[PDB]
Design a protein around this ligand. Structure first.
Ligand SMILES: Nc1ncnc2c1ncn2[C@@H]1O[C@H](CSCC[C@H](N)C(=O)O)[C@@H](O)[C@H]1O
Lengths: 10, 451
């Protein structure tokens, strides 16, 4: 789950 | 009040809830108590964790409910955390500038666990009382009895530190009970050879199914006539030294497809895949999936292309290539370290022939060192694989380094700089050269800012 956007909606 | 017409005790009883009071259950209108039930997870028996399972089969795109709980602002929640020791964001949902905390008051949605590969549901932003809320929407058709999994859409190191890689089949039955239910399908044999990839030695007692014995004997599943289909992914039950079965939290089991991919039985791999075998099934502790075991066999076995065929078949069956290890390194990260340039380019060509919807989703993932797939190749001096990856996605720098959000651009710049930090003059020179000859039309400012 460690993306560039390091519970929540989406 | 109208609350007096809502008896939460019957809701908790029918939903099999035993760790909440009547006043702490906050129901909603779209809650489908008839479709799901709260049960236990034997893998999480020590921590006392539970889960949400399907009482009946559920189609894809079905409303499950709304994440309810106590309402706070972003500042009030931090104040509550700082004033109450022991409080945690484990049950906190950050939606619409508000925080919905279910650590003490919630509904049935608070029991859904985490999964970033086999998630069968997702959170969707909707409106209730003209206010932003979150709902649970099934992303796949659910079979009765399976556990619901969802992506929390947030990252924390404690998760990838000791989160069990969950599968939908992981239920409340123990290993002994599961074997007792299916004693007719399991025979107790001894390991003929050794298996480093499964921590098994010669002579170790293992309870296995007929499919497993056929796979271990290098036979062909198609040559057998009467093969039951229910035991397709019935796993290999290990037996401890006390002649008692090791439980799930005690040891990691594996499925016939895992051993098939590790041994290179391409035809049996195809048979298992076409017989509904979970190609994305993961081990609990280690997290090894069929692709990781295929890469291990490729690295170990001398014959190489036999595993390339298995990888190609897995990609053709739309396997989730976005799996990662506990080092936050995806399938591509580790594959670039074990495949030769030719076979790596072949796998990239397979994925290209599939032609995914959005390529940038493969580059948004970063490892423990904050390096993507290209930065990973450049940190290990794998220039040619980085070139073929840029050939897959040519707009890599245009979208990730030259966008509106200057924060993400600067973050990618600094990550690439930290990657190329330990370089000499020759490597930096050939890097800038290959960047210029690539024809990606890189402006000079970035070429200066990069180093
Ligand atoms: N994949 C996973 N493996 C092990 N524990 C997990 C997990 N995903 C979530 N959890 C645990 O579940 C919590 C999320 S709230 C989920 C409800 C809770 N697990 C329960 O059984 O009542 C977290 O605190 C985490 O410790």
């Amino acid at each position: 789950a460690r993306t560039k956007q390091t519970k929540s909606t989406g | 009040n109208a609350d007096e017409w809502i008896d939460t005790s019957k809701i908790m009883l029918d939903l099999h809830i035993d760790n909440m009071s009547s006043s702490d259950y906050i129901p909603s209108a779209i809650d489908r108590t008839d479709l799901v039930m709260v049960q236990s997870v034997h893998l999480l028996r020590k921590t006392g964790g539970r889960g949400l399972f399907a009482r009946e089969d559920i189609p894809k795109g079905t409303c499950i409910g709304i994440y309810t709980g106590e309402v706070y602002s972003e500042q009030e929640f931090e104040q509550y955390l700082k004033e109450h020791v022991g409080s945690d964001k484990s049950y906190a949902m950050y939606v619409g500038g508000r925080v919905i905390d279910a650590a003490r008051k919630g509904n049935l949605t608070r029991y859904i666990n985490f999964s970033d590969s086999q998630d069968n549901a997702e959170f969707v932003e909707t409106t209730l009382n003209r206010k932003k809320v979150a709902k649970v929407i099934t992303t796949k058709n659910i079979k009765a009895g399976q556990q619901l999994l969802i992506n929390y859409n947030t990252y924390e190191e404690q998760a990838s530190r000791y989160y069990y890689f969950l599968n939908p089949g992981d239920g409340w039955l123990s290993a002994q009970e599961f074997y007792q239910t299916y004693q007719s399908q399991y025979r107790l044999e001894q390991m003929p050879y050794n298996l480093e990839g499964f921590d098994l030695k010669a002579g170790d007692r293992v309870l296995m199914t007929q499919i497993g014995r056929i796979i271990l004997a290098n036979y062909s599943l198609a040559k057998e006539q009467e093969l039951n289909a229910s035991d397709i992914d019935l796993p290999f039950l290990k037996v401890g030294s006390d002649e008692k079965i090791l439980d799930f939290d005690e040891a990691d089991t594996f499925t016939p497809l895992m051993a098939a991919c590790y041994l290179g039985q391409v035809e049996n791999v195809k048979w298992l895949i076409e017989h509904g075998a979970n190609i994305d099934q993961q081990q609990s502790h280690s997290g090894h999936c069929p692709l990781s075991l295929t890469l291990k066999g490729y690295s170990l076995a001398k014959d190489t292309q036999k595993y390339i065929d298995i990888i190609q078949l897995l990609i053709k069956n739309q396997v989730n290539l976005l799996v990662h290890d506990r080092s936050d390194k995806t399938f591509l990260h580790n594959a670039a370290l074990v495949l030769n340039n030719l076979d790596f380019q072949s796998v990239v060509k397979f994925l290209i022939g599939q032609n995914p919807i959005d390529i940038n989703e493969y580059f948004t993932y970063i490892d423990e060192n904050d390096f993507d797939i290209v930065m990973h190749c450049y940190n290990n001096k794998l220039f040619d694989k980085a070139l073929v990856l840029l050939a897959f996605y040519p707009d890599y720098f245009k979208r990730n380094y030259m966008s509106d959000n200057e924060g993400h651009n600067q973050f990618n710049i600094n990550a690439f700089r930290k990657a190329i930090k330990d370089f000499n003059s020759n490597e930096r020179s050939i890097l800038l050269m290959q960047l210029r000859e690539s024809g990606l039309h890189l402006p000079e400012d970035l070429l200066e800012q990069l180093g």
